[PDB]
């Protein structure tokens, strides 16, 4: 419990799945290209959680066209439509920053 | 516990682990220790967290006390005598009483002891 939990309670979102670092994740982001309101899919390895309730973030990392991209979304953010877990992961760390220096077959997270 | 704000006892940060280990070995052995007052204030949350592992009594608690104390004779008297004596007291196993300061450096002194 915290002092500021009666403020965050109406702003939380139910139905966000359980995912840990190492889990391959699709993220459906609301995108405004002018006045269109489309939906863009971001597929990558979740590498980080930094908790706290309404202030909790997570970081996904993909390899786009020979160039690595990271995105640090907040959980409970209304610009994420829904998260859908693709592949569970079996890692030993909890922050997984060693993936920022490996490319190719050496950056393959296990399948458990 | 709460870390020491400001400079540590005895100079380095590694001497303070050995001082609070030696002062806890001597407190649980005799029952009453005369020392300087800033060391008695620093011993009081450290030594009461070892008595909490005595009240639980399992094997995992004995390995956790042996991470700090190296004297096995005082580990035995902590789990067979000190532990079950505080079996019905919810915390607060120690007491600090202030003594006259000492000649030579005017260091303020206090005694730290178990309750009964």
């Amino acid at each position: 419990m915290n002092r500021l939990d009666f403020v965050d309670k109406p702003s939380l979102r139910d139905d966000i799945p359980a995912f840990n670092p190492g889990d391959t994740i699709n993220v459906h982001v609301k995108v405004i290209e002018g006045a269109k309101e489309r939906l863009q899919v971001f597929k990558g390895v979740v590498i980080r959680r930094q908790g706290g309730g309404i202030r909790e973030t997570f970081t996904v990392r993909k390899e786009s066209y020979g160039v690595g991209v990271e995105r640090t979304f907040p959980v409970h953010s209304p610009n994420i439509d829904h998260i859908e877990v693709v592949t569970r992961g079996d890692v030993r760390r909890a922050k997984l920053y060693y993936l920022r220096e490996l490319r190719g077959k050496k950056a393959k997270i296990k399948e458990k | 516990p709460k870390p020491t704000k400001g400079p540590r006892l005895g100079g380095s940060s590694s001497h303070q682990k050995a001082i609070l280990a030696n002062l806890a070995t001597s407190l649980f052995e005799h029952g009453r220790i005369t020392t300087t007052e800033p060391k008695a204030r620093a011993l009081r949350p450290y030594a009461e967290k070892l008595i909490t592992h005595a009240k639980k009594g399992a094997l995992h608690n004995r390995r956790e006390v042996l991470k700090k104390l190296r004297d096995k004779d005082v580990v035995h008297t902590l789990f067979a005598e000190i532990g079950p004596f505080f079996a019905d007291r919810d915390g607060g196993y120690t007491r600090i009483i202030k003594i006259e300061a000492r000649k030579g450096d005017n260091a303020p002194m206090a005694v730290i002891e178990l309750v009964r």
Partner: protein, 54 residues
């Protein structure tokens, strides 16, 4: 830096009078039927025989 001129008798006494010991407060203790005086911060150890009254 050195002192340029020696301080006169009115400036070396106005400073030196401010170097002085502060007195402590004393309270009453009757242990073993003999009344003594200790500071209040040592009032517990007077009632436990930890204070040597010389």
């Amino acid at each position: 830096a050195v002192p340029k001129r020696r301080k006169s008798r009115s400036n070396t006494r106005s400073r030196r009078s401010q170097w002085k010991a502060a007195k402590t407060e004393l309270v009453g203790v009757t242990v073993a039927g003999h009344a003594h005086k200790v500071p209040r911060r040592l009032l517990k150890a007077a009632r436990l025989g930890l204070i040597d009254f010389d």
